[PDB]
Amino acid sequence: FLKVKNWETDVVLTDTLHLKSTLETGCTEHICMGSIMLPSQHTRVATKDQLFPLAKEFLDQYYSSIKRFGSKAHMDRLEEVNKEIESTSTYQLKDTELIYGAKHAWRNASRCVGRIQWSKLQVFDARDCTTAHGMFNYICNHVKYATNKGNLRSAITIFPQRTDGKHDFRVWNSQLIRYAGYKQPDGSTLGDPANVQFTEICIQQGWKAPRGRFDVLPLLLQANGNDPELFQIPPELVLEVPIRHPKFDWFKDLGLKWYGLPAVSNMLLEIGGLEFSACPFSGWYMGTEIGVRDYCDNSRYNILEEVAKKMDLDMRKTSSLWKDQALVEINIAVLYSFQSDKVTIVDHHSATESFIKHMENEYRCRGGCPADWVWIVPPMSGSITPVFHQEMLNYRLTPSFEYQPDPWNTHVWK
Amino acid sequence: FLKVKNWETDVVLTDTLHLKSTLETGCTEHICMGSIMLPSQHTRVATKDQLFPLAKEFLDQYYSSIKRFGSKAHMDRLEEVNKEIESTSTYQLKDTELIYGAKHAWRNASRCVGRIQWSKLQVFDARDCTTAHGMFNYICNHVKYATNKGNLRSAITIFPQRTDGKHDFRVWNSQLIRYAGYKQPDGSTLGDPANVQFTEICIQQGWKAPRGRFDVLPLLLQANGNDPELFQIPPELVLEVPIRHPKFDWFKDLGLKWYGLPAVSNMLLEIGGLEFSACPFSGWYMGTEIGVRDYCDNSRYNILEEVAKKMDLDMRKTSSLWKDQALVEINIAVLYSFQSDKVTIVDHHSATESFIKHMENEYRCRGGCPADWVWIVPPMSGSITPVFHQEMLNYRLTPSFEYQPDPWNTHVWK
Numbered sequence: 001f002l003k004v005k006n007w008e009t010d011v012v013l014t015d016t017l018h019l020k021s022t023l024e025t026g027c028t029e030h031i032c033m034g035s036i037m038l039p040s041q042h043t044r045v046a047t048k049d050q051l052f053p054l055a056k057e058f059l060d061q062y063y064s065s066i067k068r069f070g071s072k073a074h075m076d077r078l079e080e081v082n083k084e085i086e087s088t089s090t091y092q093l094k095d096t097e098l099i100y101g102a103k104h105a106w107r108n109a110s111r112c113v114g115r116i117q118w119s120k121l122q123v124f125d126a127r128d129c130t131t132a133h134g135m136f137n138y139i140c141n142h143v144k145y146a147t148n149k150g151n152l153r154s155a156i157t158i159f160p161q162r163t164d165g166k167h168d169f170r171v172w173n174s175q176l177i178r179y180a181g182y183k184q185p186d187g188s189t190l191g192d193p194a195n196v197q198f199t200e201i202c203i204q205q206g207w208k209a210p211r212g213r214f215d216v217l218p219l220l221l222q223a224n225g226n227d228p229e230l231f232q233i234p235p236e237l238v239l240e241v242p243i244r245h246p247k248f249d250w251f252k253d254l255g256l257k258w259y260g261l262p263a264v265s266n267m268l269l270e271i272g273g274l275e276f277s278a279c280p281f282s283g284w285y286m287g288t289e290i291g292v293r294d295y296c297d298n299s300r301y302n303i304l305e306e307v308a309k310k311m312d313l314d315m316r317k318t319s320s321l322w323k324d325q326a327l328v329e330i331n332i333a334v335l336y337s338f339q340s341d342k343v344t345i346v347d348h349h350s351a352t353e354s355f356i357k358h359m360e361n362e363y364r365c366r367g368g369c370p371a372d373w374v375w376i377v378p379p380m381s382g383s384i385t386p387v388f389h390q391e392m393l394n395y396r397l398t399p400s401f402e403y404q405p406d407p408w409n410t411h412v413w414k
Numbered sequence: 415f416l417k418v419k420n421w422e423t424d425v426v427l428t429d430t431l432h433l434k435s436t437l438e439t440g441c442t443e444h445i446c447m448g449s450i451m452l453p454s455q456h457t458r459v460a461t462k463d464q465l466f467p468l469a470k471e472f473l474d475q476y477y478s479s480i481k482r483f484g485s486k487a488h489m490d491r492l493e494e495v496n497k498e499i500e501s502t503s504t505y506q507l508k509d510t511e512l513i514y515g516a517k518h519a520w521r522n523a524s525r526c527v528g529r530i531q532w533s534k535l536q537v538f539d540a541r542d543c544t545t546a547h548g549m550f551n552y553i554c555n556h557v558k559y560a561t562n563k564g565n566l567r568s569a570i571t572i573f574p575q576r577t578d579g580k581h582d583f584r585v586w587n588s589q590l591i592r593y594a595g596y597k598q599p600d601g602s603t604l605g606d607p608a609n610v611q612f613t614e615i616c617i618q619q620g621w622k623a624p625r626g627r628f629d630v631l632p633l634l635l636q637a638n639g640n641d642p643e644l645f646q647i648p649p650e651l652v653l654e655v656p657i658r659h660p661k662f663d664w665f666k667d668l669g670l671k672w673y674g675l676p677a678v679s680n681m682l683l684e685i686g687g688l689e690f691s692a693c694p695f696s697g698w699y700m701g702t703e704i705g706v707r708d709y710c711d712n713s714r715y716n717i718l719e720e721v722a723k724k725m726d727l728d729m730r731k732t733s734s735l736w737k738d739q740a741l742v743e744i745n746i747a748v749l750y751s752f753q754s755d756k757v758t759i760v761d762h763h764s765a766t767e768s769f770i771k772h773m774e775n776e777y778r779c780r781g782g783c784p785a786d787w788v789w790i791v792p793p794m795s796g797s798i799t800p801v802f803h804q805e806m807l808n809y810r811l812t813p814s815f816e817y818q819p820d821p822w823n824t825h826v827w828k
């Protein structure tokens with residue numbers, strides 16, 4: 001029954017939820033790895049024996065969720081998937097068990113500050129899919145729906161679960177919409193340095209790059225273990241916000257823009273022991289993810305010098321805080337640009353307050369809320385947002401989202 | 415033999431130092447408490463039995479440090495304090511063992527970004543002190559020395575170790591130089607809200623407050639268990655930087671200022687099992703500690719609105735990032751003000767780069783460097799400083815600095 005304090009408000013919350021926790025974290029009693037980016041625990045091949053307790057555990061919270069824990073419909077469903085796990089060494093979720101598992105995977109994501117919206121998640125069941133083309137169609141219907149003309153909506157599309165392991169649905173994109181990354185002669189990078197390995201993988205499979213900055217990458221979709229295939233999202237479906245500033249008219253001259261739809265596609269969704277290797281999910285952007293990380297990370301677009309230049313900034317000494325000054329401006333423009341286009345965006349203040357609000361309800365009507373402070377604190381102006389001052393317990397509940405290796409490092413090809 | 419990566423540079427460092435670790439962290443395999451502010455492990459009454467392994471462990475690294483591990487002078491010193499621990503149920507450090515233990519307490523402080531300077535620490539041995547007045551004199555000689563007319567120097571003053579526990583030297587100030595905090599009629603706060611409980615404690619013992627903003631508090635010094643006593647640092651010894659901006663001439667009109675000398679006085683220094691309950695230590699300020707936390711924390715001076723006002727800032731909508739804009743300005747002024755006065759200050763960029771440099775040498779010539787990411791990442795512009803992208807292993811080595819309860823909640827009075 002652990003206590004967590006908010007040192008800005010002296011609010012104390014009591015966490016019992018962490019007792020239901022199951023998975024391990026990477027920390028021990030003599031070492032804390034809370035700052036390791038991809039702990040071996042957060043990465044993802046299972047058998048039929050451990051598979052039933054997982055099913056049991058998940059089915060018991062789900063019937064407990066729809067009020068009727070331990071009833072006949074529960075006991076039958078337990079026997080039912082017991083039977084099905086004996087016979088097939090795996091099983092299938094009901095439509096509702098899948099919607100529930102997905103929403104709670106998000107709910108349990110300790111690194112996600114947007115979780116106040118976890119209950120309003122749209123679950124598209126793609127488990128009937130069999131081909132890369134059908135994947136492409138489900139993904140496009142996802143994009144269109146979640147984009148909703150800038151009034152963005154949370155959604156997830158769940159392709160068939162892993163079975164043997166060699167028959168595996170995977171989106172090879174990290175996100176359905178990402179800009180291409182091209183190395184240059186001198187070595188420098190056009191576009192997004194993050195995706196340079198992925199961009200050339202696409203060309204290795206036949207992409208015809210328009211070698212510029214913001215070239216929306218094509219989808220590389222692997223279906224049921226087969227070699228992936230290239231499909232270009234219809235451009236009318238990829239909404240984009242050109243970035244201007246509400247003061248500096250040279251900001252348009254910077255010629256930047258970003259897509260409205262954040263949509264992570266490389267993660268693994270775990271539910272009742274079942275593994276969904278392709279499950280792209282989307283919501284809306286927090287300002288900082290674009291203006292701080294995408295735009296100003298050194299190994300991303302790296303625009304701080306160019307913005308500071310135009311601002312006429314003391315770029316000599318480090319202590320001029322020119323980098324900080326040009327970073328707040330870039331985030332002012334991103335927010336303003338997205339808002340003047342009716343494209344859903346949230347600032348890091350509004351988003352981190354709501355997370356504290358969310359944390360309250362989770363400790364009240366759930367007994368806790370796993371939270372990773374390393375990741376919840378926004379990457380600029382940490383301590384002026386209320387999550388900097390909120391102690392948080394990190395633990396691993398299931399259903400959950402896990403990392404998984406890249407397909408091209410595991411795919412037994414051709 | 416754990417690995418930590420820098421995701422900005424793809425640098426990998428290998429940590430074996432954590433194997434020498436001894437104390438626990440608060441994390442377990444199923445829960446990470448890396449964001450708990452004062453874990454029960456980081457707080458501080460010991461006997462004579464566990465006291466010798468502690469002495470042994472510390473003496474073995476110290477003679478290993480001066481090259482002659484296991485020699486006769488080592489073995490004799492081991493027998494010597496063995497003998498002394500049998501006879502007195504405690505023991506005394508040699509002058510050099512104390513200088514070493516202190517420097518390594520700092521070296522091991524995982525929450526300190528300034529640790530690149532740990533070897534150049536000036537150790538003042540105050541273990542002959544017996545009276546609050548003698549404390550006051552050692553503390554003043556500390557202030558004067560460390561201040562060094564703005565060319566600040568790192569130092570620590572070590573008062574006698576705890577023995578029985580009822581005879582205990584304690585500085586009741588959190589820092590030797592802090593501004594007084596006064597509640598008002600309407601409830602609001604003049605001065606520093608942090609110290610309001612301490613400020614009225616001082617008046618409870620007879621302080622004559624000049625009830626303004628930046629009133630340097632008096633020292634409240636407890637010596638050998640006796641009731642503490644009030645002493646006012648000579649004002650010529652308290653250096654102060656008035657805060658101006660190198661653009662906004664109304665910034666002087668804000669009328670702010672800060673002391674040059676950060677000097678934490680409430681911590682407990684542990685060496686070879688011995689407990690030094692009063693051990694004030696000082697270095698120089700990182701810009702952000704004043705301009706971000708001191709000035710802009712909600713429950714500190716809370717000047718963001720007043721600075722934004724004068725900047726003529728979009729203070730209506732939250733998403734205007736006015737708070738961020740006024741926060742970078744305040745930090746530009748702090749750095750500039752301290753630098754135009756030849757008072758040693760370091761910006762959070764320069765300081766966090768040096769910490770990465772420091773981390774390199776610690777993994778190379780020591781096998782690791784315990785680091786608390788929650789605390790090493792500066793509280794503004796996190797991800798544009800290189801420590802945001804540096805994975806860090808947190809573990810607890812000794813000699814170390816520990817928190818300890820406030821004296822007025824433990825002091826058996828009068």
Ligand code: HEM
Nearest residue numbers: 106109111112113114117154156281282283284285286401
């Ligand atoms: C609705 C708006 C949302 C916002 C504003 C939001 C915000 C964020 C942010 C800022 C991060 C940190 C990632 C980074 O900065 O690199 C994150 C991580 C994450 N989010 Fe959310 N998110 C949203 C929706 C969703 C949805 C719909 C899901 C799943 C269905 C989700 C699941 C996750 C996961 C799994 C992580 C990372 C966990 C990890 O890395 O281990 N989020 N989110």
Ligand code: HEM
Nearest residue numbers: 520523525526527528531568570695696697698699700815
């Ligand atoms: C020389 C310049 C120094 C700088 C720039 C510096 C910087 C910092 C900063 C920014 C923090 C985080 C505290 C906060 O933001 O609230 C910190 C913590 C700390 N520093 Fe350093 N510091 C310096 C010198 C020292 C010295 C001389 C010592 C000890 C002799 C020391 C030991 C510590 C300890 C023990 C902590 C906190 C550990 C904890 O809270 O558990 N530092 N320092």
Ligand SMILES: CCN(C)CCc1cc(F)c(F)c(OCc2cc(C)cc(N)n2)c1
Nearest residue numbers: 114262263264267281282283284285286289
């Ligand atoms: C190398 C890893 N690093 C780059 C972080 C990558 C990452 C992994 C992950 F699973 C995530 F959910 C993630 O969330 C971004 C995100 C997703 C959604 C739906 C909304 C918002 N607003 N944001 C970001």
Ligand SMILES: CCN(C)CCc1cc(F)c(F)c(OCc2cc(C)cc(N)n2)c1
Nearest residue numbers: 528676677678681695696697698699700703
């Ligand atoms: C409630 C706790 N919270 C307010 C943090 C307090 C705290 C505790 C502590 F032991 C510290 F060493 C500390 O370091 C401040 C510091 C010290 C020195 C020598 C230099 C710099 N530049 N800075 C700050």
Ligand SMILES: C[C@H](O)[C@H](O)[C@H]1CNc2nc(N)[nH]c(=O)c2N1
Nearest residue numbers: 035036037374375802803804805
């Ligand atoms: C070293 C550290 O684990 C890494 O830089 C983390 C820190 N916190 C983060 N927080 C978020 N939201 N996103 C990130 O990519 C990271 N990166």
Ligand SMILES: C[C@H](O)[C@H](O)[C@H]1CNc2nc(N)[nH]c(=O)c2N1
Nearest residue numbers: 388389390391449450451788789
């Ligand atoms: C909740 C959290 O533990 C607390 O706010 C910490 C976060 N990191 C920090 N880091 C530093 N340097 N100083 C602090 O006071 C804090 N506060």
Ligand SMILES: [Zn+2]
Nearest residue numbers: 027032441446
């Ligand atoms: Zn931990």
